[PDB]
Design an enzyme around this catalytic site. Structure first.
Site, short mmCIF file in Angstrom:
data_model
loop_
_atom_site.label_atom_id
_atom_site.label_comp_id
_atom_site.label_asym_id
_atom_site.label_seq_id
_atom_site.Cartn_x
_atom_site.Cartn_y
_atom_site.Cartn_z
N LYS A 1 -10.11 -35.40 -8.33
CA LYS A 1 -8.94 -35.12 -9.14
C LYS A 1 -9.21 -34.06 -10.21
O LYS A 1 -10.36 -33.75 -10.57
CB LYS A 1 -8.47 -36.42 -9.77
N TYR B 1 -14.99 -18.18 -38.62
CA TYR B 1 -13.86 -18.74 -39.32
C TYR B 1 -14.28 -19.92 -40.18
O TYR B 1 -15.13 -20.75 -39.82
CB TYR B 1 -12.83 -19.21 -38.30
C1 LIG Z 1 -11.10 -41.01 -11.97
C2 LIG Z 1 -11.17 -42.31 -11.16
C3 LIG Z 1 -12.39 -42.62 -10.53
C4 LIG Z 1 -13.68 -41.83 -10.72
O1 LIG Z 1 -14.24 -42.20 -11.97
P1 LIG Z 1 -15.66 -41.84 -12.55
O2 LIG Z 1 -15.74 -42.68 -13.78
O3 LIG Z 1 -15.66 -40.39 -12.84
O4 LIG Z 1 -16.64 -42.20 -11.48
C5 LIG Z 1 -12.45 -43.75 -9.74
N1 LIG Z 1 -11.38 -44.57 -9.62
C6 LIG Z 1 -10.21 -44.30 -10.24
C7 LIG Z 1 -9.01 -45.24 -10.10
C8 LIG Z 1 -10.11 -43.17 -11.02
O5 LIG Z 1 -8.93 -42.96 -11.64
C1 LIG Z 2 -7.17 -13.61 -31.87
C2 LIG Z 2 -7.14 -12.38 -32.79
C3 LIG Z 2 -5.96 -12.14 -33.51
C4 LIG Z 2 -4.77 -13.08 -33.56
O1 LIG Z 2 -5.07 -14.14 -34.45
P1 LIG Z 2 -4.12 -15.26 -35.01
O2 LIG Z 2 -4.97 -15.93 -36.04
O3 LIG Z 2 -3.78 -16.16 -33.87
O4 LIG Z 2 -2.93 -14.55 -35.55
C5 LIG Z 2 -5.89 -11.00 -34.29
N1 LIG Z 2 -6.96 -10.17 -34.40
C6 LIG Z 2 -8.11 -10.41 -33.73
C7 LIG Z 2 -9.31 -9.47 -33.86
C8 LIG Z 2 -8.20 -11.53 -32.93
O5 LIG Z 2 -9.38 -11.74 -32.31
N1 LIG Z 3 -11.79 -41.38 -13.95
C1 LIG Z 3 -12.22 -41.32 -15.39
C2 LIG Z 3 -11.59 -40.15 -16.12
C3 LIG Z 3 -10.41 -40.55 -17.00
C4 LIG Z 3 -9.30 -41.18 -16.37
C5 LIG Z 3 -8.96 -41.29 -14.94
N2 LIG Z 3 -9.45 -42.60 -14.49
C6 LIG Z 3 -7.48 -41.06 -14.63
O1 LIG Z 3 -7.14 -41.20 -13.44
O2 LIG Z 3 -6.67 -40.68 -15.51
N1 LIG Z 4 -7.75 -15.33 -33.01
C1 LIG Z 4 -8.11 -16.69 -33.52
C2 LIG Z 4 -8.59 -17.60 -32.40
C3 LIG Z 4 -10.10 -17.75 -32.34
C4 LIG Z 4 -10.88 -16.57 -32.16
C5 LIG Z 4 -10.46 -15.22 -31.73
N2 LIG Z 4 -10.29 -14.43 -32.96
C6 LIG Z 4 -11.40 -14.57 -30.72
O1 LIG Z 4 -11.11 -13.40 -30.38
O2 LIG Z 4 -12.36 -15.19 -30.20
#
Ligand SMILES: *Cc1c(COP(=O)(O)O)cnc(C)c1O
Ligand SMILES: *Cc1c(COP(=O)(O)O)cnc(C)c1O
Ligand SMILES: NCCCC[C@@H](N)C(=O)O
Ligand SMILES: NCCCC[C@@H](N)C(=O)O
Lengths: 357, 357
Positions: free
Chosen positions: A33, A253
């Site tokens: 999944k 940041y």
């Molecule tokens: C996701 C899921 C699993 C697998 O779980 P793991 O903890 O990752 O082994 C098995 N059975 C069900 C019903 C699940 O939802």
């Molecule tokens: C991601 C990014 C932005 C936009 O930033 P916000 O905080 O989401 O407005 C602007 N400038 C640079 C250089 C960025 O990396």
């Molecule tokens: N399988 C463990 C991971 C989290 C939840 C999962 N059991 C689900 O089907 O939502």
């Molecule tokens: N823009 C804010 C969101 C996080 C980081 C972003 N500035 C980047 O380019 O990685």
């Protein structure tokens, strides 16, 4: 292009599936999944197809994805259908189907079906997620049997705390399941990864390993069998900029981190939009050119910073392992109250490069 | 099929872009890196194309995605090139390109270029992520000018703490920038969303709004201008199972939550693989059929649980808003030390349904 990528080792995947079968002596549904927990459902299914008893997914669309790709092994829909209108394609694509609630049972009883359904009847044995209460389970079973719409029934449940080896909840849930299903004919299916690896008294004709396939332990400490798992995903990138800083200079940041001394910082092409956790604290382990190092400064959307001060040979173009066989993804996740499952599922944007197919 | 989906209101997107332009009197690059912070870069660019001065993305592939879709407005690569081999396509697709480090400068100086480059020269004015130190900025500028490889230069920097309105770091960074760029000809670009919304003394010929476009405030408290933003994404699903429980019954993995009293719990088709945070605590706000409610029990990969006890009219098929115009995504994220940026970027698996195109 950006040096970020996720390596997916399909040999490791096969190894881990085999471990589950060997440890249990049971048939095993590979739980893939959520796009095989971020690893790629089609590619992981193709890799396991030759030896897998079957697959399990969250919903009919994940099931259809696999069928479109040519997967012919059994596929279980773990939550069943969400709409009764799914039933004609469930039958036509031969999906095994969980039935966990009364409305699904009722829809089956009034549905016109071209072929009978293979149903996995799910009991709520104490997790209180989906399924019939123990006291309602027998009547549900008899209603499936009486409907003439159902071929086999597999009796199923799921554990809430099997990752807690010192917690008896797993024992309690098994007891309730066994008591409520006693005398009913059919195979049973109870074990997820922690129960496969850690609860050898729990029965199951069908086991359902998810997280162990990906080579991450569900447990908080070493375990002799979980220790044998091989990590499947390597999240890696490279250093794209280097900076020398005096002491007391804020990095990233929020200035959560300030340089402790005169330091050399490297910017890495990886961030939280890719799935690397924004919660990762200063001091988080990373591997730089094959040697342990630490993350310093808050992770950005696209970029993160690491400490290169004690890595004099490292610099522009150095390879950084964010998680993988040297940097366990589960230990990372548990640092800030997550589980490996989440980080792997959050993988986005970067290329996935498969080996071992 | 599964009832999970993400609604994307493109009218709200346009509204928010317009606010940024109106508040600043500046040209504005719509920042749509990371697939428009999970909202869909192509669709958001198409919606803004008629009125946007340009777009900004993280890397050449995000840029190419837009060009392939027919976007003709300027596109800025915010980290420049990662490999010098990108330069021929940067020129051919007319990408504006950040230059933040010496190796990029050197690659431009020795590159054979068919047309000159429009370069955004980036200064590190105190965030210590990428860019030239103030003391190195002038020489870098003169080297671009002398190269004969460069057409316009825009002088740029970026703020580490502009979301902290009571913190003078923004003032300090501006002072350093202004001092180091004084007397250099060209437009400047400094303001991100918090500086656009909250720092009206900061100059900029080009502003770079990201998070405000999506209708999430960067600030921890109400603000008269940020208050006017309209949330763009609605993450919603439906109740797929209902269960009555006595008091003291554990719900979900880990039993973090036990029922406080006799309760009715609803299972919702939404989980952390979709981007809903696993860290969300019991008591987290959700909207159920248009009324406030709470999340109880640990979020699973595919499923989550809500309290239906005080919602007698709600049940199977009830609509649940996980985030959106009633449930602010930023307030949710800050509950457990995240920011709205991360949750929006983590969106996966569910359909995105656009309105207002
Ligand atoms: C996701 C899921 C699993 C697998 O779980 P793991 O903890 O990752 O082994 C098995 N059975 C069900 C019903 C699940 O939802
Ligand atoms: C991601 C990014 C932005 C936009 O930033 P916000 O905080 O989401 O407005 C602007 N400038 C640079 C250089 C960025 O990396
Ligand atoms: N399988 C463990 C991971 C989290 C939840 C999962 N059991 C689900 O089907 O939502
Ligand atoms: N823009 C804010 C969101 C996080 C980081 C972003 N500035 C980047 O380019 O990685």
């Amino acid at each position: 292009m950006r040096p970020a990528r996720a390596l997916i080792d399909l040999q490791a995947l096969r190894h881990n599936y085999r471990l589950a079968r060997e440890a249990t002596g049971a048939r095993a549904l590979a739980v893939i999944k959520a796009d095989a927990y971020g690893h790629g459902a089609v590619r992981c299914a193709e890799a396991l197809a030759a030896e897998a008893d079957g697959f399990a997914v969250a919903c009919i669309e994940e099931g259809l994805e696999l069928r479109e790709a040519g997967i012919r092994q059994p596929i279980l829909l773990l939550e069943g259908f969400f709409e009764a209108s799914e039933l004609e394609l469930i039958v036509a694509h031969d999906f095994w189907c969980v039935v966990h609630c009364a409305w699904q049972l009722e829809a089956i009883e009034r549905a016109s079906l071209a072929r009978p359904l293979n149903v996995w009847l799910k009991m709520d044995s104490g997790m209180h997620r989906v399924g019939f209460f123990p006291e309602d389970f027998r009547a549900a079973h008899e209603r499936l049997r009486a409907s003439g719409k159902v071929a086999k029934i597999v009796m199923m449940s799921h554990f809430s705390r099997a990752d807690e080896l010192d917690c008896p909840r797993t024992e309690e849930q098994l007891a309730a399941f066994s008591a409520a299903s006693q005398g009913l004919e059919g195979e049973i299916s109870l074990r997820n990864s922690p129960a496969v690896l850690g609860w050898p008294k729990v029965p199951s004709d069908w086991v359902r390993p998810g997280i162990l396939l990906y080579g991450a332990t569900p447990f908080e400490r070493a375990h002799p069998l979980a220790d044998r798992l091989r990590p499947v995903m390597t999240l890696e990138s490279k250093v794209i900029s280097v900076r020398d800083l005096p002491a007391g200079e804020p990095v990233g940041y929020g200035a959560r981190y300030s340089t402790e001394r005169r330091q050399r910082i490297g910017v890495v092409a990886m961030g939280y939009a890719d799935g690397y956790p924004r919660h990762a604290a200063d001091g988080t382990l990373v591997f730089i050119d094959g040697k342990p190092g630490r993350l310093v400064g808050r992770v950005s959307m696209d970029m993160l910073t690491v400490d290169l001060t004690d890595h004099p040979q490292a610099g522009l173009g150095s390879r950084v392992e964010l998680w993988g066989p040297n940097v366990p993804v589960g230990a990372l996740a548990a640092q800030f109250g997550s589980i490996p499952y989440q980080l792997l599922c959050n993988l986005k944007r970067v290329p996935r490069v498969y080996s071992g197919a």
